[PDB]
UniProtKB/Swiss-Prot annotation, chain A:
SUPFAM superfamilies in UniProt: Ribulose-phoshate binding barrel
Active site: K64 (proton donor)
InterPro entries reported in the protein's UniProt record: Aldolase_TIM (IPR013785), OMPdecase (IPR014732), OMPdecase_arc (IPR047595), OMPdecase_AS (IPR018089), OMPdeCOase_dom (IPR001754), RibuloseP-bd_barrel (IPR011060)
Family membership noted in the UniProt record: Belongs to the OMP decarboxylase family. Type 1 subfamily.
PROSITE patterns: OMPDECASE
Broadest EC class assigned to this enzyme: lyase
Task of the protein: Catalyzes the decarboxylation of orotidine 5'-monophosphate (OMP) to uridine 5'-monophosphate (UMP).
Name of the protein described by the UniProt record: Orotidine 5'-phosphate decarboxylase
Subunit text: Homodimer.
CDD domains attached to this UniProt entry: OMP_decarboxylase_like
Amino acid sequence: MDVMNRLILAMDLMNRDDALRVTGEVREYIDTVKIGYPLVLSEGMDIIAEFRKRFGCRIIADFKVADIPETNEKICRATFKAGADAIIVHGFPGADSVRACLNVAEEMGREVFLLTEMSHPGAEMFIQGAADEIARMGVDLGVKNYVGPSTRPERLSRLREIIGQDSFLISPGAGAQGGDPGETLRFADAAIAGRSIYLADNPAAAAAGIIESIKDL
Amino acid sequence: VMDVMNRLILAMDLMNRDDALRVTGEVREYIDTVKIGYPLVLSEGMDIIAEFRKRFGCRIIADFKVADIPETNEKICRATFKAGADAIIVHGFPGADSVRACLNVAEEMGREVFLLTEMSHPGAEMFIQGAADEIARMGVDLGVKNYVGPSTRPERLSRLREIIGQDSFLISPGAGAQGGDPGETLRFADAAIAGRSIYLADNPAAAAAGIIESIKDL
Ligand SMILES: O=C1CC(=O)N([C@@H]2O[C@H](COP(=O)(O)O)[C@@H](O)[C@H]2O)C(=O)N1
Ligand SMILES: O=C1CC(=O)N([C@@H]2O[C@H](COP(=O)(O)O)[C@@H](O)[C@H]2O)C(=O)N1
């Protein structure tokens, strides 16, 4: 996956007009957009097609899929029918639930991103202790795309070690949550940026600023 | 606690608007509480909640298994309650701050949060089961009053009930299609969730009636 400037936009605005405007303002810097439930539940799944039509960008559906196998398959099918190129799935619910997603992705020509450890403080309670094992599970299942925390570079580094250099790794947490884009890119292929861009007085300048800081990478 | 008719909640996971409406309408005389999840919402839109309210006036539990960071969880809950959902289901494994974010929005918006502790599928044994008791205890400490536990594991459902106490509200999926028994499930849960055993039956109404008949004494 060729992510322009190794920067993925987390478009979590909840208004179609604003989401489209801001995304358009940074289109010259980013060609990969992560769309989650904040926008989808506010504007509908048709927003994904609107983005591909307007920006011809790659779309990662960040739905943190975390249901039983049967329901997971339905969620993935509905998501890919909407035009998403990939979907993010939680690993905590187990191997069968992840496999269900992998099956639909293969069937519709899409990619599955396995979320191992999360970036927020609460991740330390239950997720962190199971993260390494979740990552190994991904390897065992043939998962090639992963999500790790920018807020804990040592943990992100460990995730990279487990999955190897061939696997693709994206990471949220830089900016608003305290992570550093440059440090994150020492281990992740691409850094995710939401508020640091869409909540900035000048989103375009914010995006340009982030890229300027990692220009040597 | 919500008064769930016949202690039976319909898991409406059909992905077709017409079929979902037909089936739900056919069993309305037996069920007044419907669980709507992403299979239907991602296929027909959040307005499906509005249509169910208008057509059936049934209570709506949005099964979105919210599992994001606090900031995003808050937005998901706000959008969901704005759409008309009476309650939303949230995962406890992401931690206390993520759950608290949902509780705060529910409190501010006058709605309810259901905390999913242990799940019913086989994969739940890998990571969730080992953290389930603590997740439940965390819920109690946070003031959570509504919970979700597995019908497929009576022993686990029983322990969950003990942890949350008799005053807490507990609903449980897994009976029927996944192998659980409605009767046994209701020994610990306030209401049992039923999806495929009802919506895939040739006669959903008869299926619902059959399930209720087997638990009439309860
Ligand atoms: O561990 C994780 C996973 C994840 O997807 N995310 C998402 O990544 C984005 C981060 O946005 P922000 O840059 O903090 O504003 C949001 O859409 C989150 O829901 C996260 O922050 N942490
Ligand atoms: O542990 C859990 C949680 C849950 O919500 N569910 C949901 O409960 C319903 C069960 O449906 P079914 O009766 O097996 O067809 C589905 O909507 C599932 O996504 C589950 O099966 N197990």
